[PDB]
Amino acid sequence: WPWQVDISFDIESLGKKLKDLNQACYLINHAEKGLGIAQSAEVLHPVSAFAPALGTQSLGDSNFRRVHGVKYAYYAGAMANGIASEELVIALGQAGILCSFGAAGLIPSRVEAAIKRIQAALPNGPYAFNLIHSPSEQALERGSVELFLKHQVRTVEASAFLGLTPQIVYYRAAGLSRDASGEIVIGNKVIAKISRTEVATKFMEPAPVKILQQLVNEGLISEDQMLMAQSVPMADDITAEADSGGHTDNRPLVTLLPTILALKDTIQAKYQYKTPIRVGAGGGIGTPDAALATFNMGAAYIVTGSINQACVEAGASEHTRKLLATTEMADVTMAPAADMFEMGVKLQVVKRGTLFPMRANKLYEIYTRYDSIEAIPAEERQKLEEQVFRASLDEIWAGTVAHFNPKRKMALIFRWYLGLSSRWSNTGEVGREMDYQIWAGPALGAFNAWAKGSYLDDYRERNAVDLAKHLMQGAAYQARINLLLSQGVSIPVSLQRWKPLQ
């Protein structure tokens, strides 16, 4: 290196200079004091190692930040039933951070209200809305899309898809237009969250002609839109969702992400889109360490979820938040999902401080083993009635009927619990604590452990914005440390990691 200097061997000061990512670091050894650092040099103590000013903006894909209009290559993933609440979106968006409104499970009127509120607060973004695939209820998907289009909601996080549907195709294609120069403008942005290559492929490739044609025919998109749709991917960003809270197939981040990046390279080479497809990732990200790891694999951006439910902005009860602050990595497990209960799908939930997973598991065993509720041995039937429902199955069924084969009846009854248990947690239903269904992964325990001993120990002091900052600033910090280490600098262990001190 070409520099020399004439500052500093003061350990506390070493920490301060290292942590200022807005300034370059010039490193000196000598003897003693034996590692020194300066923030200015000149083209006579020469310089042994260097780190440039590289901050949070240096992580991830700059195009992600440009396209979404955000300060970080980060987003807070949707959380069902308004858990990713209006307050959450607004707080994050006010900070220049992307967040997906948790539309899943909410009624249309509720979603409309959220749109209005969010748009009032964030007239020029950033924000996204969750569009969840609803296999059983196509009309509902159509409805959400119409709403989004009606209000010019420009960004959607598409999740739980098994491939394309006419509704997501419609959203995508309806946003396309030509600029003065004749180039395609992609007005409706899509972030497709996936865990399989088969589905990723569908979103990385253009929409099919036949679906497009029907949309033209139905008067939903224009001929040119149909044409344009054939030359742009179905999503701008692909979120690889590894092992995570909620619905998940438990794939390792370190294998999923690389696999999807491989796929990306393949598709990009084949289509040569003018704007390259981006691949980001989530699932397991609760620390600076994990955040950096994910960027380091080639993630365009990172996604958090579990840690955000723990924050004061989230639509989750005080009880629940409090409990989330104590939840360790061993305190989560797989349990039956209300959605696709019948096929045995499971989701990752909290199992300490609640009996939900045991109870859900019981409902599945019973559902699968009996023909009808009548076949359930008056025996365990009565314990269910006592411990789970707190009312005869018949009475549950009556309520259900007012909310409007025997196997189907049994499911409908059981889904009362599977469904309401999530609501109970979200709203804080008193006396129903032991039945709270609370979605979370190992990310949360990771976070908690990382934060132990800090101000973050108090659930009341957890703000989504702050968490984002820690992950991003921490990652950036640790990137600098790696750079110096790579060069043979002896950074003291106590400075090697970003910890929450303030």
Ligand X SMILES: Cc1cc2nc3c(=O)[nH]c(=O)nc-3n(C[C@H](O)[C@H](O)[C@H](O)COP(=O)(O)O)c2cc1C
List residues binding Ca ion (CB under 5 A): 244, 246-248
Cα(317)–Cα(91) distance, rounded to whole angstroms? 18
Q: Does residue number 95 form part of the binding site for ligand X (CB under 6 A)? A: no
Tell me which of 36, 77, 233, 336 binds ligand X, using CB under 6 A: 77
Residues 483-502 that bind a second copy (CB under 8 A): 483, 486-488, 493-494, 496-497, 499
Tell me which of 30, 110, 150, 452 binds a second copy, using CB under 8 A: 452
> Closest approach of Cβ 133 to Ca ion, in Å?
13
**Nearer to ligand X (CB atom), residue 367 or residue 439:** 439
**Nearer to a second copy (CB atom), residue 117 or residue 497:** 497
Residues 231-260 that bind ligand X (CB under 6 A): 241, 244-246
Amino acid found at 469: K
Residue 209: both structure tokens together: 């002609």
8-state DSSP, 389: I
Q: Nearest to ligand X by Cβ — which residue?
A: 305
Which is nearest to 102 in space by CA: 59, 157, 58, 56? Answer: 157
Please indicate if the annotation marks 475 as binding a ligand: no
Residue 277: CB partners within 8 Å, gap ≥ 6?
204, 233, 235, 236, 237, 238, 264, 267, 268
> Closest approach of Cβ 117 to a second copy, in Å?
34
> Closest approach of Cβ 289 to a second copy, in Å?
4
Which is nearest to 35 in space by CA: 22, 19, 48? Answer: 48
Q: Does residue number 317 form part of the binding site for ligand X (CB under 6 A)? A: no
Paired residues of 25 in beta bridges = 51
Residue 146, SS3 per DSSP:
helix
Helices (H), 207-332: 209-217, 223-228, 253-271, 288-296, 306-309, 318-324
Paired residues of 335 in beta bridges = 347
Q: Which does 296 bind (CB under 5 to 8 A by kind): a second copy, ligand X, Ca ion, none?
A: a second copy
**Nearer to a second copy (CB atom), residue 405 or residue 486:** 486
> Closest approach of Cβ 6 to a second copy, in Å?
17
End-to-end Cα spacing for the chain? 35
Q: What is the 3-state secondary structure (H, E, C) of 415-472?
A: HHHHHHHHHHHHHCCCCCHHHCCCECCHHHHHHHHHHCCCHHHCHHHCCHHHHHHHHH
Q: Does residue number 325 form part of the binding site for a second copy (CB under 8 A)? A: no
Beta strand ranges found along 55-196 (DSSP E): 74-76, 98-101, 128-132, 155-159, 176-178, 184-186, 189-194
Residues 194-223 that bind a second copy (CB under 8 A): 196-197
**Nearer to ligand X (CB atom), residue 126 or residue 284:** 284
Query: Of 111-119, 174-182, 261-269, 427-435, which segment contacts a second copy by CB under 8 A?
Result: 261-269
Find out whether 18 and 25 touch, Cβ atoms under 8 Å: yes
Question: Roughly what angle, to the nearest 10 degrees, separates helices 393-402 and 406-427?
Answer: 80
> Closest approach of Cβ 8 to Ca ion, in Å?
46
Query: Of 148-156, 291-299, 300-308, 473-481, which segment contacts ligand X by CB under 6 A?
Result: 300-308
Residue 18, SS3 per DSSP:
helix
Residue 265: both structure tokens together: 């390279």
Query: Of 14-22, 77-85, 144-152, 182-190, which segment contacts ligand X by CB under 6 A?
Result: 77-85
> Closest approach of Cβ 427 to Ca ion, in Å?
21
> Closest approach of Cβ 487 to a second copy, in Å?
7
Q: Binding site membership for NAD(+): which residues? A: 81, 339, 403, 415, 423
Q: Binding site membership for FMN: which residues? A: 78, 80, 130, 159, 193, 241, 245, 284, 305-306
For binding to ligand X (CB under 6 A), which residues are involved? 77-80, 83, 102, 104, 130, 132, 159, 193, 241, 244-246, 282-285, 303-306, 309, 439-441, 443
